[PDB]
């Protein structure tokens, strides 16, 4: 959510080789502070990631195969 | 009288060809009707 | 050698990876549960080496000495 594109919006905000960047980054870090708590909202972990999710989708891919078998026998 | 036609049709329904297995013929065909599918 | 020892135990380790991805079928939720611990001490490794019958009291000791 906000953690995603918030990085995208903070990312372009860097400007000038001069150390004025902090004046921008102070606006960033506060959001990041919120992110530190926004991340708390997302303190969950069901599935790991890939490839386990891919294994799930493939698991249905075999599990959807019978549907074109016995159901065909129904017809 | 109730059991009759009901048993017949239910054989003809999802079972359709209940003889389709043909005993041993229903062995590898169970893959041919399924594992062969792609 | 200035000792060294193995322990072996049954254990229970549920995992989510099957808990929801499976079931709803001929697929058990909880078993639950059973395993075969094989500790490999005085190494700090405590590695859980695979077991697969046939297995004997010897072969463990052999792999371990290896």
In a 13 Å sphere around the CA of A18, the CA atoms on its Cβ side amount to 3
C4, C39 Cβ separation under 8 angstroms: no
Distance CA A39, CA A3 (A): 8
Query: What tokens does C22 get?
Result: 């499976």
Q: Which two tokens stand for residue C62?
A: 């052999």
Tokens 């990085």 -> residue = A7
CB proximity A27 to B under 8 Å: no
* CA angle, C45 then A50 then A9, to 5°: 115
Give the three-class secondary structure for C50. coil
* Residues of A (45-74) whose Cβ lies below 8 Å from B: 65-66, 68-70, 72-74
The HSE-up count of residue A56 (CA atoms within 13 Å, CB side) is: 16
Could you identify the residue written with the tokens 């990876």? C17
Q: What are phi and psi of A26, to 5 degrees?
A: -65, -35
Determine contact, residues C57/C51, Cβ cutoff 8 Å: no
Torsion, Cα A19 A25 A29 A30, to 10 degrees, reads: 120
Q: Which chains touch C (3 or more CB pairs under 8 A)?
A: A
Q: Is A17 helix (H, G, I), strand (E, B) or coil?
A: coil
C20 touches chain A (CB under 8 A): yes
How many Å apart are CA B32 and CA B21, to the nearest integer?
12
- Count of positions (residues) in chain C: 66
| A54 Cα to chain C: minimum distance (Å) | 11
Nearest to C16 among A46, A59, A63 (CB): A46
To what resolution in angstroms was this structure determined? 4.4
Q: Six-digit token pair at B35?
A: 């594992």
Q: What is the CA radius of gyration of chain B?
A: 13
The 3-state secondary structure of B1-34, one letter per residue:
CHHHHHHHHHHHCCCCCCCCCCHHHHCCHHHHCC
DSSP C8: E
Which of A65, A74, A75 comes nearest B34 by C-beta? A65
């Amino acid at each position: 959510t906000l953690l995603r594109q918030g990085i995208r919006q903070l990312k372009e905000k860097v400007s000038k080789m001069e150390p004025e960047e902090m004046t921008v980054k102070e606006k960033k870090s506060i959001i990041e502070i919120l992110k530190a708590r926004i991340a708390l909202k997302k303190a969950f972990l069901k599935m790991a990631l890939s490839e386990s999710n891919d294994t799930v989708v493939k698991k249905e891919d075999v599990r959807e195969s019978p549907v074109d078998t016995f159901m065909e026998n129904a017809t | 009288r109730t059991h009759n036609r009901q048993m017949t049709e239910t054989l003809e329904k999802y079972k359709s060809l209940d003889f389709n297995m043909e005993k041993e013929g229903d062995v590898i065909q169970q893959l041919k009707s399924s594992i062969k599918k792609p | 050698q200035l000792g060294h020892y193995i322990h072996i135990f049954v254990n229970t380790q549920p995992i989510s990876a099957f808990e929801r991805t499976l079931s709803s079928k001929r697929s058990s939720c909880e078993y639950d549960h059973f395993l075969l611990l094989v500790e490999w001490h005085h190494d700090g490794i405590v590695e859980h080496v695979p077991l697969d019958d046939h297995m004997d009291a010897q072969h463990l000791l052999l792999l371990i000495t290896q």
